[PDB]
Curated annotation (Swiss-Prot), chain C:
Lineage: superkingdom: Bacteria
Source organism per UniProt: Weissella oryzae (strain DSM 25784 / JCM 18191 / LMG 30913 / SG25)
Function of the molecule: When overexpressed the N-terminus (residues 1-476) cleaves rat synaptobrevin-2/VAMP2 between '89-Trp-|-Trp-90' in vitro. This releases the cytoplasmic domain of VAMP2 from the synaptic vesicle membrane, which would prevent the assembly of the trans-SNARE complex on the membrane and thus prevent vesicle-target membrane fusion and neurotransmitter release.
Phylogenetic placement of the source organism: Bacteria, Bacillati, Bacillota, Bacilli, Lactobacillales
Other comment: There are seven antigenically distinct forms of botulinum neurotoxin: Types A, B, C, D, E, F, and G, but serologically this does not belong to any of them.
Entire-sequence positions represented here: 1275 to 1323 of 1336
Family: Belongs to the peptidase M27 family.
Stated name of the protein: Putative botulinum-like toxin Wo
Length: 469, 98, 49
């Protein structure tokens, strides 16, 4: 597991200088750069015009050298935590053996440019996943691709922005959903970009919002978020990916042909033979059920909306295990109670959904084979098609390049604002049980009740569900 | 009633009680994938067992295949004979047949 | 895998562990994982193979 000084292929927030970063190999072909994502401008809370939801902003976080070697010890403790899980290192081995097709001899489409003591670029090192620090936004775990080769069949090198310092907590159980549950969710999604499957473009409706707009997810997002109903892969005459599987199959089964078209090593040709041995059935049926935790009993229902499901009170810090206290929590609705004020239920739900109203009407279906396929509603182990021991015996050598750097610009997301309604209700609602069931006083002065119309009116009494309790 | 009908036996896939000294295809229940020795050595590699194109009531169903890979007896700890049944808590020794 | 043989318990030098091993479908774990019997194994769902 080598460690290099890397002249990065991007520029630090419009500085137009060479970005020289210290990369570390944390798994084969998986590099960690324990610095923040310099390519989007690192701001403070007061500098952000329109902040995202649940989005703690803070500069100076991985500018220090001590706490950015604490960041490498959090990535190295995370990949050692995925390795200790069942089927965990066969995912990490699938990511290791998912080297994209070379653009030319050597690899000027997937390599990090290594530089000597002086900056003389002497060789480049093969990368698949670069595991960056947080961006401007600290909980904005993303999977930025290097190229648009991820929608091409070639496969693209992947930058994995990830922050282990922000976790979801099962508030009733006080079990912390670990950092690696979102890291396995993103290494899964890296496989669909390292194989050249264009599954990040089309967004499929998953959650109808209050104005009949849809919180839409990609087939990459849908498969990677573990088991979930409205399966992509619900065989009942395969329905999902209407006329899109034929594109994904042509992207996969053409890149398998061009495998000796450009020769790099005897090991680059040997990983590319082992890469297209994990069939396209295996990618679409990746289940990481043994690797993710069942901390949140519902994690396989929602489409990765764990922070909205559990609420923003559940987002905690790694080092403190308490609430983040600096996340902008901008609710969608402020439901206030009439007969006594200060009983607000801040409804943090989703907004600004896509207008996919004419989606289930214009639903094309693929030409079915007219065959009942005996399936089983549970997931499957699918790494039995993965040549997992044959990947681990291959280490790709460093490639002598001494060629100049091609820079690729990074243009971020433009998030919409969250307009907060201020609803004043004259009557108890289901939302006003959350306000009523919480209290901030001791046992001598708690005064519990089993009635909403007394806990909501008094602001001294607390709601409960059983008159004996 | 369904759990207590099965009693204290460990069953086949076909629903019949397991037996010592009986040739058993050992499969994985999720892929239905079966063991296989690496090229010349005695190390095992779990390989996938192909499905079956049947006709079920005149249709063209595609169902799980089970006859793949290595077979394993369950030899008991001092060998008796074949038709003894395996119960919950019965320790054995999986012997290769090939 | 009980961890014993017909000659008694198998040496952890020869075997690798000493107690029970579930037999999984994961190479690179060696198709074995330790049966966890600590006071944390029922905090989540067991995921039996």
């Amino acid at each position: 597991l080598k460690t290099e000084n890397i002249r990065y292929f991007r520029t630090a927030a419009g500085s137009e200088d060479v970005l020289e970063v210290k990369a570390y190999e944390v798994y084969p072909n998986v590099w960690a750069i324990p610095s923040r994502y310099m390519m989007e401008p690192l701001q403070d809370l007061d500098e952000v015009t329109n902040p995202e939801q649940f989005s703690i902003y803070d500069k100076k976080y991985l500018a220090d050298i001590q706490e950015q070697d604490e960041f490498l010890k959090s990535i190295q403790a995370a990949i050692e935590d995925i390795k200790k899980r069942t089927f965990g290192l066969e995912l990490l081995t699938a990511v290791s053996g998912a080297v994209p097709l070379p653009k030319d001899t050597g690899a000027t489409n997937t390599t990090l440019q290594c530089i000597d003591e002086n900056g003389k670029h002497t060789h480049d090192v093969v990368a698949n996943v670069v595991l960056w620090g947080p961006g401007n936004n600290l909980n904005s775990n993303r999977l930025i691709s290097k190229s648009d080769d991820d929608s091409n069949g070639i496969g693209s090198m992947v930058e994995l922005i990830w922050n282990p310092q922000i976790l979801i907590k099962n508030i009733g159980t006080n079990r912390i959903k670990p950092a690696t549950d979102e890291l396995v969710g993103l290494l899964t999604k890296a496989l669909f970009r390292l194989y050249g499957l264009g599954l990040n473009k089309i967004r499929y409706p998953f959650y109808q919002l209050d104005d009949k707009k849809y919180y839409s997810l990609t087939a990459e997002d849908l498969i990677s978020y573990g088991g979930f109903s409205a399966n992509v892969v619900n065989l009942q005459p395969y329905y999902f990916l209407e006329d899109q599987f034929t594109k994904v199959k042509e992207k996969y089964e053409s890149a398998k042909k061009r495998i000796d078209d450009i020769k790099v090593n005897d090991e680059y040709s040997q990983m590319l033979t082992l890469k297209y041995q994990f069939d396209l059935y295996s990618l679409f049926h990746i289940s990481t059920s043994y690797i993710v935790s069942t901390v949140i009993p519902a994690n396989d229902k929602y489409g990765g909306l764990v922070s909205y499901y559990t609420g923003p009170n559940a987002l905690i810090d790694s080092k403190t295990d308490e609430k983040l206290t600096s996340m902008v929590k901008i609710p969608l609705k402020k439901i206030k109670y009439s007969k006594n004020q200060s009983r607000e239920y801040d409804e943090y739900d989703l907004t600004n959904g896509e207008d996919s109203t004419q989606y289930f009407e214009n639903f094309t279906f693929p030409k079915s084979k007219h065959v009942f396929v005996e399936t089983q509603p549970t997931p499957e182990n699918v790494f039995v098609n993965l040549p997992s021991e044959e990947i681990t015996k291959i280490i790709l050598p460093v490639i002598p390049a001494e060629s100049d750097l091609i820079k690729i610009p990074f243009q971020p997301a433009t998030p919409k604002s969250i307009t907060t309604e201020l609803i004043t209700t004259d009557v108890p609602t289901l939302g006003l049980i959350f306000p009523a069931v919480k209290s901030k006083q001791n046992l001598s002065d708690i005064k519990m009740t089993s009635k909403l119309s007394d806990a909501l009116d008094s602001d001294k009494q607390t709601f409960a569900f059983d008159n004996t309790l | 009633t369904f759990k207590e009908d099965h009693g204290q036996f460990v069953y086949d896939h076909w629903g019949e009680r397991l037996q010592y000294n009986k040739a058993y295809y050992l499969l994985s229940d999720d892929n239905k994938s079966a063991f296989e020795t690496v090229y010349e050595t005695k190390r095992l590699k779990l390989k996938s067992v192909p499905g079956v194109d049947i006709k079920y009531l005149g249709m063209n169903d595609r169902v799980y295949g089970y006859y793949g890979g290595l077979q394993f007896k369950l030899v008991p700890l001092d060998s008796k004979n074949m038709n003894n049944y395996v119960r919950w808590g019965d320790k054995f020794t999986m012997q290769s047949i090939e | 895998g009980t961890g014993n043989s017909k000659q008694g318990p198998i040496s952890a030098y020869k075997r690798g562990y000493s107690g029970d091993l579930w037999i999984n479908g994961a190479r690179l774990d060696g198709y074995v994982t330790v049966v966890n019997k600590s006071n944390y194994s029922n905090d989540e769902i067991q995921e039996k193979f």
